[PDB]
Amino acid sequence: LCDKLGKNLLLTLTVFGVILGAVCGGLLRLASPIHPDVVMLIAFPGDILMRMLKMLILPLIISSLITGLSGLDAKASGRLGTRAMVYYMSTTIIAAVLGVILVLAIHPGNPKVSSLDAFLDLIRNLFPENLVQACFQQIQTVTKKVVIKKGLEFKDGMNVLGLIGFFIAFGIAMGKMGDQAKLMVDFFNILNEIVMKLVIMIMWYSPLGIACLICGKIIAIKDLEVVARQLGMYMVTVIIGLIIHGGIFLPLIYFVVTRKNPFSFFAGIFQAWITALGTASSAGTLPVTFRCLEENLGIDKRVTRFVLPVGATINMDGTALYEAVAAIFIAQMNGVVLDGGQIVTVSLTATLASVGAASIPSAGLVTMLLILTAVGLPTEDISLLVAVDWLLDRMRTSVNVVGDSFGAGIVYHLSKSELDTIDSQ
Amino acid sequence: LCDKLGKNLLLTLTVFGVILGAVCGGLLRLASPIHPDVVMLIAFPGDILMRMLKMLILPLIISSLITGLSGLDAKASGRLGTRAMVYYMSTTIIAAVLGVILVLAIHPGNPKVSSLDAFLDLIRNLFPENLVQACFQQIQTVTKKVVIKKGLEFKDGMNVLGLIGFFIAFGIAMGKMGDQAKLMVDFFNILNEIVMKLVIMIMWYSPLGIACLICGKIIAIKDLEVVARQLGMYMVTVIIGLIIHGGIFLPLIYFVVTRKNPFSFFAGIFQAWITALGTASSAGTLPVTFRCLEENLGIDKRVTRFVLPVGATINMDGTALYEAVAAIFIAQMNGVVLDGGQIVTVSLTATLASVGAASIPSAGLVTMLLILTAVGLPTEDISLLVAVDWLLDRMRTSVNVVGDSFGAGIVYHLSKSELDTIDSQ
Amino acid sequence: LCDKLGKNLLLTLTVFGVILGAVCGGLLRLASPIHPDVVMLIAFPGDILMRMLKMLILPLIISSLITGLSGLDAKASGRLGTRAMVYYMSTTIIAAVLGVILVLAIHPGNPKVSSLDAFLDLIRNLFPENLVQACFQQIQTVTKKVVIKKGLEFKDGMNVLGLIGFFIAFGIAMGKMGDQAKLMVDFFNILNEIVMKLVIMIMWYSPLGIACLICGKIIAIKDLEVVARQLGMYMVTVIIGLIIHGGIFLPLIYFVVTRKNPFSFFAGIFQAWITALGTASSAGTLPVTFRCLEENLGIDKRVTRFVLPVGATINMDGTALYEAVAAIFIAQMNGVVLDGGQIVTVSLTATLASVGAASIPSAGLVTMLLILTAVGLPTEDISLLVAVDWLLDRMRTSVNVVGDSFGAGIVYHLSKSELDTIDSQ
Ligand SMILES: CC(C)CCC[C@@H](C)[C@H]1CC[C@H]2[C@@H]3CC=C4C[C@@H](OC(=O)CCC(=O)O)CC[C@]4(C)[C@H]3CC[C@]12C
Ligand SMILES: CC(C)CCC[C@@H](C)[C@H]1CC[C@H]2[C@@H]3CC=C4C[C@@H](OC(=O)CCC(=O)O)CC[C@]4(C)[C@H]3CC[C@]12C
Ligand SMILES: CC(C)CCC[C@@H](C)[C@H]1CC[C@H]2[C@@H]3CC=C4C[C@@H](OC(=O)CCC(=O)O)CC[C@]4(C)[C@H]3CC[C@]12C
Ligand SMILES: N[C@@H](CCC(=O)O)C(=O)O
Ligand SMILES: N[C@@H](CCC(=O)O)C(=O)O
Ligand SMILES: N[C@@H](CCC(=O)O)C(=O)O
């Protein structure tokens, strides 16, 4: 047990903290009248953890976007890389939109302005007038009686969408610079590494903060049965989203573009799928999916050796669907109804959050803060999903490993002629 | 025609967009009652263009000022470079002040707080207490009844003057660092190049945005005759400013400092002046003005080879006068009366905007946003000047080519002894 | 006298400006009814100096913290360096807390919200949700009647504590990067050098600004006797703090950790103490304290050669006590009572300000702006302490030279065995 617990010390501490917070909240529930100041003090370390995590989303957005869009090696990759990237973005967006549809349909949490103006505000926030203002303020439409007056007022909160847009453009241009801008790419690589070190430093404090957050959420909520039902229905929504996506949409895509049976493709990647369901890490399953594709499905080594390592981090269908579903679920437990602009923001920032989330287990929860602050939702509600994360995490990594495999198959099919010409010469 | 239109594709697209927007606005004028939401939708791509242009004025201010003030090579230039720089700044400021005088006199557009407090607020904004706040907020004096209470309140809007002051000081100090700070000069060179690439990317979208802006302005305004008269009088103001400046002030300066006939100097640069009136580009006329000065006017090759290439971009009298005139004209069509501090801000930011504006045709309109956001004016009114830009642009480049020529003559006269000593040894 | 005045030109100008401002304020006192606009104009150059100094506290905080925490050479120093650093921070914090205690006791200046919420707000500001917002805004608790509602509202003012925390973490992580991040360390070294050049540029303007500030403060205040008494009692508070600290706390520490007579240690450093009382510069006395320790007290050359040069700038007990005392004194003349969070902020930023303040004479006043803007106090009141700085400065540098000497003795005692082992091998 000493090697068992000491192997993944962070995981042991996080599980112990979650259990300790849950049991302490349950025990404190016995004192039915509770002082708001006392519950504030109990949840305060959770606030500290949330504040140190939200403190770093701006340097992470900047450095991550710049570093990723510069270190693409597009010319070296070729058209194979472009096909892989298009497939990655397409499937991630499909997964995010499917998740949004499923939450807005099932609405777990609801049991408990003009749309045109909302979309125009979305487009306005996508192009902020000022970067320093966009770091903490979003513009919005307000109509107040004086036929009716409408103007633009700055509401507080990070303008995540606008910053992401500007720094995607910035990274693209700086990559287009080429061998120049090497100094600035190195500067932002160093900045990103420093911020990741800070994020790990925070993650070591995470057990105590999560324990306090869960204790506060348990002691605060009125009816435990209502929240249990909401959590169960949220998990059902995520599971249905993953099943539909990774068992219908991806097979349908692979059949449309390749005219081949996707169920004959499934058997080839069954071992990779099981390993993902066990390892709960897309990166760990990577050698397994190489061997499975290369020997069972006969995919060429060039296309798999490119697609799989990149898709193990960039291409995460399940995490995207999970993040969209859970962001709308956090919105729905609070009673906050989301405008069209906020729904589109959830979709886009769920595509971005999936890309950022590394293949380490339980990173979607960390990247969730991107969506939560983009929409402006109470970030404290993450602990509820922390409670049941792991079971969804296994399914998520299974789905996105299946997505990687189908992408490898599709890109190989669309590049059979090119590889034939290369081998002939 | 295919080579005609395909040669300057951006110019073809911009002219086509301006004509299309004007004709579409004229056609939509037939539906006299028009919905504010519909006109908002029509002008929305114009808002997107304006927002992407205003989004980049802060990185342009920072990177441009730093790069320019570092890459001066003052020691290599000598006293000849200092004389050239002094002449450039002096004539640019004279042109800007003359333009301000002429607009405040003729007031095209008007047909349609204590001054001491205004100037003190100007000096306060020149030295901001905080850079991050100066990026989006200016301080101002407010007097409200309670002998009378006066305090300082932060009004929204970029503090362009304060940022320019701080980063001029920053660039000067970093240049004084010398061979050190090479890394930071390289960093800011890369940043400036990236932002210029983004500006070009935006400029390719410019035709659609300008078309929508002109359509919105045509459909919104009440009487077309009033706006036509205002535009005509604004063009008359710019033309009178250019005539007075480049036919009186510059010849008077050259006669005062050299005791020589400036009209004998004019004939030497007549070919350069005509080429500028045709090419509409100060950089393009540059070989012509070299040959004209060097052979007709006998100016030494050292002084001309230094003055002309630098003055082709730094020294723009006509663009400075144009930008001051047009900023006050935009203020005057809106009914906004300008305090003394705002007038001085217009003058200073018109000197800076002329320096920044590259010798490519129709760049003063892009640099105009510096002045418009420094004073806090509706940037959408740029399209009105876009309509009649080119005719003023030809005169502007003619005037500033004349300014370059007179600067070369003056600097040669003030450096006859130094060049004589150099040649003797 | 020409060499006398021309030797320290800045000091001559500052003393002349202080005397000129005092005499001009005294003369203007004869016109008892004075216009608020006229006194505003008189003190305006003081406002310009204060604004240019406050303008640079953010780049100084960032660059100084990053540069210092990277250029530590912890591995090369060894455990001797760690012991020296621990002693430095411990004694600086003790001095700051002693100063806070002494001002809150004697309260020079007073003659003229829940504490839990205050401390929670302190901890919240220590971890800001946004860096760009933390650059100019602090969060605070507000309770307004509707049992009672409490929420968080953003009050204006720099969040110095949060920025210091984040950039201490940033510098620590970037130092941990090692030979990587050399580019970013070089970038921030260049930035720090540039900002120091700007600070010197401002300091050359300091005489006029200080003269105008003292003139405004003399003409504004009602009773000169009251302010004279307050200044005298403030000086008495600083002197008592220095006496208690450097004659009880440091000797007591050295006796506790070494079991040796600290008064036998005092005689060894008497010459260094006198030189500090004369030179008014900790760096200048440095060779004197080397010779005194090395020959009178027999401290080993390794430990002294490490401790003394580092402690001449990092370790300033007297400046820390002075800065805490004077920040609370500035708060007390204005009638502003300080919450617990503001007192802790004064203590922490007084520890930081002492570290930053270079060993040049009269730098504590410049670093005082860190504390004054951290707490949000009128920075114009610095001139009152400027009037009587020098006499306190001599005592301050005497006390912190004594602190350096006691640190060298203590670190040598705690490292006798290590040096014995090194010499034996
Ligand atoms: C699930 C239902 C809603 C179907 C939706 C799926 C399609 C809309 C998307 C998903 C994957 C996309 C494919 C992913 C890969 C590519 C290669 C890519 O081809 C390129 O243009 C590469 C550049 C080049 O050819 O040089 C874009 C088309 C295509 C077939 C995409 C076509 C559109 C697809 C099939
Ligand atoms: C149009 C009416 C209002 C006359 C206004 C023009 C003058 C006020 C300005 C315009 C050009 C300026 C001249 C431009 C060039 C120089 C060289 C320069 O000399 C230097 O000090 C260079 C440094 C050195 O000598 O080492 C400054 C003076 C002078 C004659 C300037 C003197 C003032 C001038 C004539
Ligand atoms: C004035 C009154 C309130 C007494 C307060 C003084 C003590 C609380 C502080 C001041 C100096 C500190 C000492 C400064 C130096 C060190 C070495 C340092 O030892 C280390 O751990 C170095 C790391 C290592 O051993 O490798 C920390 C303990 C100690 C004795 C500190 C113990 C606590 C001290 C005595
Ligand atoms: N489960 C993901 C990691 C991120 C997440 O849990 O959302 C994977 O390894 O594929
Ligand atoms: N016409 C200017 C370019 C900038 C502007 O049009 O204002 C020139 O080439 O001299
Ligand atoms: N007197 C200090 C310098 C900083 C200050 O005066 O506070 C010293 O030289 O030790």
Side-chain angles (χ1 to χ4, degrees), chain C residues 333-353:
Chain C
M333 294 183 286
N334 278 292
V336 179
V337 68
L338 286 198
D339 295 330
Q342 289 162 309
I343 292 295
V344 174
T345 298
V346 170
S347 164
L348 302 175
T349 57
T351 62
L352 276 296

PDB file of all heavy atoms in Angstrom, chain C residues 333-353:
ATOM      1  N   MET C 333      -1.114  61.664   9.895  1.00  0.00           N
ATOM      2  CA  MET C 333      -1.376  63.095   9.752  1.00  0.00           C
ATOM      3  C   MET C 333      -2.652  63.357   8.969  1.00  0.00           C
ATOM      4  O   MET C 333      -3.285  64.400   9.155  1.00  0.00           O
ATOM      5  CB  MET C 333      -0.229  63.842   9.079  1.00  0.00           C
ATOM      6  CG  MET C 333       1.055  63.909   9.848  1.00  0.00           C
ATOM      7  SD  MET C 333       2.222  64.900   8.909  1.00  0.00           S
ATOM      8  CE  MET C 333       2.643  63.770   7.597  1.00  0.00           C
ATOM      9  N   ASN C 334      -3.040  62.442   8.093  1.00  0.00           N
ATOM     10  CA  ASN C 334      -4.230  62.627   7.280  1.00  0.00           C
ATOM     11  C   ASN C 334      -5.503  62.211   7.996  1.00  0.00           C
ATOM     12  O   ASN C 334      -6.593  62.397   7.449  1.00  0.00           O
ATOM     13  CB  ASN C 334      -4.098  61.845   5.974  1.00  0.00           C
ATOM     14  CG  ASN C 334      -3.288  62.584   4.940  1.00  0.00           C
ATOM     15  OD1 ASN C 334      -3.714  63.613   4.425  1.00  0.00           O
ATOM     16  ND2 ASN C 334      -2.109  62.066   4.633  1.00  0.00           N
ATOM     17  N   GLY C 335      -5.397  61.659   9.198  1.00  0.00           N
ATOM     18  CA  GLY C 335      -6.557  61.158   9.895  1.00  0.00           C
ATOM     19  C   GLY C 335      -7.021  59.796   9.442  1.00  0.00           C
ATOM     20  O   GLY C 335      -8.003  59.282   9.987  1.00  0.00           O
ATOM     21  N   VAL C 336      -6.346  59.191   8.470  1.00  0.00           N
ATOM     22  CA  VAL C 336      -6.735  57.877   7.971  1.00  0.00           C
ATOM     23  C   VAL C 336      -6.338  56.839   9.012  1.00  0.00           C
ATOM     24  O   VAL C 336      -5.152  56.648   9.289  1.00  0.00           O
ATOM     25  CB  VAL C 336      -6.085  57.578   6.617  1.00  0.00           C
ATOM     26  CG1 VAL C 336      -6.484  56.198   6.135  1.00  0.00           C
ATOM     27  CG2 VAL C 336      -6.471  58.635   5.604  1.00  0.00           C
ATOM     28  N   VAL C 337      -7.322  56.172   9.596  1.00  0.00           N
ATOM     29  CA  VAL C 337      -7.040  55.030  10.454  1.00  0.00           C
ATOM     30  C   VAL C 337      -6.895  53.797   9.575  1.00  0.00           C
ATOM     31  O   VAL C 337      -7.611  53.633   8.580  1.00  0.00           O
ATOM     32  CB  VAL C 337      -8.140  54.856  11.518  1.00  0.00           C
ATOM     33  CG1 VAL C 337      -9.457  54.437  10.886  1.00  0.00           C
ATOM     34  CG2 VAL C 337      -7.703  53.855  12.575  1.00  0.00           C
ATOM     35  N   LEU C 338      -5.944  52.939   9.917  1.00  0.00           N
ATOM     36  CA  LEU C 338      -5.581  51.811   9.074  1.00  0.00           C
ATOM     37  C   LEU C 338      -6.158  50.524   9.643  1.00  0.00           C
ATOM     38  O   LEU C 338      -6.035  50.257  10.842  1.00  0.00           O
ATOM     39  CB  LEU C 338      -4.062  51.703   8.945  1.00  0.00           C
ATOM     40  CG  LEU C 338      -3.393  52.745   8.052  1.00  0.00           C
ATOM     41  CD1 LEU C 338      -2.013  52.289   7.653  1.00  0.00           C
ATOM     42  CD2 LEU C 338      -4.231  52.999   6.823  1.00  0.00           C
ATOM     43  N   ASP C 339      -6.786  49.733   8.778  1.00  0.00           N
ATOM     44  CA  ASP C 339      -7.290  48.428   9.166  1.00  0.00           C
ATOM     45  C   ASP C 339      -6.130  47.474   9.427  1.00  0.00           C
ATOM     46  O   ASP C 339      -4.961  47.801   9.220  1.00  0.00           O
ATOM     47  CB  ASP C 339      -8.193  47.861   8.075  1.00  0.00           C
ATOM     48  CG  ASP C 339      -9.446  48.679   7.874  1.00  0.00           C
ATOM     49  OD1 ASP C 339      -9.923  49.291   8.850  1.00  0.00           O
ATOM     50  OD2 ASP C 339      -9.955  48.711   6.734  1.00  0.00           O
ATOM     51  N   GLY C 340      -6.465  46.271   9.888  1.00  0.00           N
ATOM     52  CA  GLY C 340      -5.436  45.265  10.080  1.00  0.00           C
ATOM     53  C   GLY C 340      -4.754  44.884   8.781  1.00  0.00           C
ATOM     54  O   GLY C 340      -3.532  44.715   8.732  1.00  0.00           O
ATOM     55  N   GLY C 341      -5.536  44.753   7.711  1.00  0.00           N
ATOM     56  CA  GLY C 341      -4.959  44.411   6.424  1.00  0.00           C
ATOM     57  C   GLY C 341      -3.993  45.466   5.927  1.00  0.00           C
ATOM     58  O   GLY C 341      -2.935  45.145   5.384  1.00  0.00           O
ATOM     59  N   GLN C 342      -4.335  46.737   6.116  1.00  0.00           N
ATOM     60  CA  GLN C 342      -3.429  47.800   5.704  1.00  0.00           C
ATOM     61  C   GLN C 342      -2.166  47.823   6.553  1.00  0.00           C
ATOM     62  O   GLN C 342      -1.086  48.119   6.039  1.00  0.00           O
ATOM     63  CB  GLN C 342      -4.149  49.144   5.752  1.00  0.00           C
ATOM     64  CG  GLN C 342      -5.185  49.307   4.653  1.00  0.00           C
ATOM     65  CD  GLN C 342      -6.175  50.410   4.944  1.00  0.00           C
ATOM     66  OE1 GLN C 342      -6.765  50.462   6.019  1.00  0.00           O
ATOM     67  NE2 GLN C 342      -6.365  51.299   3.982  1.00  0.00           N
ATOM     68  N   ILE C 343      -2.270  47.504   7.843  1.00  0.00           N
ATOM     69  CA  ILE C 343      -1.078  47.433   8.685  1.00  0.00           C
ATOM     70  C   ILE C 343      -0.157  46.311   8.221  1.00  0.00           C
ATOM     71  O   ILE C 343       1.066  46.484   8.135  1.00  0.00           O
ATOM     72  CB  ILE C 343      -1.480  47.262  10.159  1.00  0.00           C
ATOM     73  CG1 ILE C 343      -2.150  48.529  10.679  1.00  0.00           C
ATOM     74  CG2 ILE C 343      -0.280  46.922  10.998  1.00  0.00           C
ATOM     75  CD1 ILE C 343      -1.242  49.713  10.722  1.00  0.00           C
ATOM     76  N   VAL C 344      -0.724  45.144   7.915  1.00  0.00           N
ATOM     77  CA  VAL C 344       0.102  44.043   7.425  1.00  0.00           C
ATOM     78  C   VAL C 344       0.708  44.392   6.071  1.00  0.00           C
ATOM     79  O   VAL C 344       1.855  44.030   5.775  1.00  0.00           O
ATOM     80  CB  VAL C 344      -0.717  42.745   7.367  1.00  0.00           C
ATOM     81  CG1 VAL C 344       0.090  41.647   6.720  1.00  0.00           C
ATOM     82  CG2 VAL C 344      -1.140  42.334   8.762  1.00  0.00           C
ATOM     83  N   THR C 345      -0.045  45.100   5.228  1.00  0.00           N
ATOM     84  CA  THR C 345       0.503  45.553   3.956  1.00  0.00           C
ATOM     85  C   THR C 345       1.671  46.503   4.171  1.00  0.00           C
ATOM     86  O   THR C 345       2.679  46.427   3.462  1.00  0.00           O
ATOM     87  CB  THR C 345      -0.587  46.227   3.128  1.00  0.00           C
ATOM     88  OG1 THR C 345      -1.620  45.281   2.837  1.00  0.00           O
ATOM     89  CG2 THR C 345      -0.016  46.748   1.832  1.00  0.00           C
ATOM     90  N   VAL C 346       1.552  47.409   5.145  1.00  0.00           N
ATOM     91  CA  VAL C 346       2.659  48.305   5.465  1.00  0.00           C
ATOM     92  C   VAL C 346       3.878  47.508   5.883  1.00  0.00           C
ATOM     93  O   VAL C 346       4.993  47.777   5.432  1.00  0.00           O
ATOM     94  CB  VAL C 346       2.255  49.305   6.561  1.00  0.00           C
ATOM     95  CG1 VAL C 346       3.470  50.044   7.051  1.00  0.00           C
ATOM     96  CG2 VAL C 346       1.256  50.283   6.031  1.00  0.00           C
ATOM     97  N   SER C 347       3.689  46.509   6.742  1.00  0.00           N
ATOM     98  CA  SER C 347       4.826  45.714   7.200  1.00  0.00           C
ATOM     99  C   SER C 347       5.507  44.998   6.038  1.00  0.00           C
ATOM    100  O   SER C 347       6.734  45.067   5.880  1.00  0.00           O
ATOM    101  CB  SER C 347       4.368  44.711   8.253  1.00  0.00           C
ATOM    102  OG  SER C 347       5.344  43.706   8.438  1.00  0.00           O
ATOM    103  N   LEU C 348       4.724  44.313   5.202  1.00  0.00           N
ATOM    104  CA  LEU C 348       5.310  43.533   4.115  1.00  0.00           C
ATOM    105  C   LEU C 348       5.976  44.431   3.079  1.00  0.00           C
ATOM    106  O   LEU C 348       7.103  44.166   2.645  1.00  0.00           O
ATOM    107  CB  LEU C 348       4.243  42.663   3.459  1.00  0.00           C
ATOM    108  CG  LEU C 348       3.537  41.690   4.394  1.00  0.00           C
ATOM    109  CD1 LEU C 348       2.428  40.967   3.661  1.00  0.00           C
ATOM    110  CD2 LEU C 348       4.534  40.709   4.970  1.00  0.00           C
ATOM    111  N   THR C 349       5.301  45.505   2.670  1.00  0.00           N
ATOM    112  CA  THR C 349       5.887  46.396   1.683  1.00  0.00           C
ATOM    113  C   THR C 349       7.021  47.228   2.258  1.00  0.00           C
ATOM    114  O   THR C 349       7.824  47.758   1.489  1.00  0.00           O
ATOM    115  CB  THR C 349       4.815  47.305   1.096  1.00  0.00           C
ATOM    116  OG1 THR C 349       4.183  48.033   2.150  1.00  0.00           O
ATOM    117  CG2 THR C 349       3.779  46.486   0.370  1.00  0.00           C
ATOM    118  N   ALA C 350       7.119  47.351   3.581  1.00  0.00           N
ATOM    119  CA  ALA C 350       8.296  47.962   4.177  1.00  0.00           C
ATOM    120  C   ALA C 350       9.473  47.007   4.182  1.00  0.00           C
ATOM    121  O   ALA C 350      10.619  47.446   4.052  1.00  0.00           O
ATOM    122  CB  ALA C 350       7.994  48.424   5.598  1.00  0.00           C
ATOM    123  N   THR C 351       9.220  45.710   4.355  1.00  0.00           N
ATOM    124  CA  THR C 351      10.294  44.744   4.156  1.00  0.00           C
ATOM    125  C   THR C 351      10.778  44.755   2.712  1.00  0.00           C
ATOM    126  O   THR C 351      11.986  44.756   2.456  1.00  0.00           O
ATOM    127  CB  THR C 351       9.844  43.341   4.552  1.00  0.00           C
ATOM    128  OG1 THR C 351       8.756  42.938   3.716  1.00  0.00           O
ATOM    129  CG2 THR C 351       9.405  43.313   5.997  1.00  0.00           C
ATOM    130  N   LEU C 352       9.850  44.773   1.753  1.00  0.00           N
ATOM    131  CA  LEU C 352      10.254  44.806   0.348  1.00  0.00           C
ATOM    132  C   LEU C 352      10.954  46.109  -0.013  1.00  0.00           C
ATOM    133  O   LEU C 352      11.945  46.101  -0.749  1.00  0.00           O
ATOM    134  CB  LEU C 352       9.057  44.579  -0.574  1.00  0.00           C
ATOM    135  CG  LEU C 352       8.611  43.149  -0.869  1.00  0.00           C
ATOM    136  CD1 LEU C 352       9.722  42.448  -1.609  1.00  0.00           C
ATOM    137  CD2 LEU C 352       8.241  42.364   0.370  1.00  0.00           C
ATOM    138  N   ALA C 353      10.450  47.240   0.480  1.00  0.00           N
ATOM    139  CA  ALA C 353      11.028  48.526   0.111  1.00  0.00           C
ATOM    140  C   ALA C 353      12.454  48.659   0.623  1.00  0.00           C
ATOM    141  O   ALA C 353      13.312  49.233  -0.055  1.00  0.00           O
ATOM    142  CB  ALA C 353      10.159  49.663   0.643  1.00  0.00           C
TER     143      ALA C 353
END
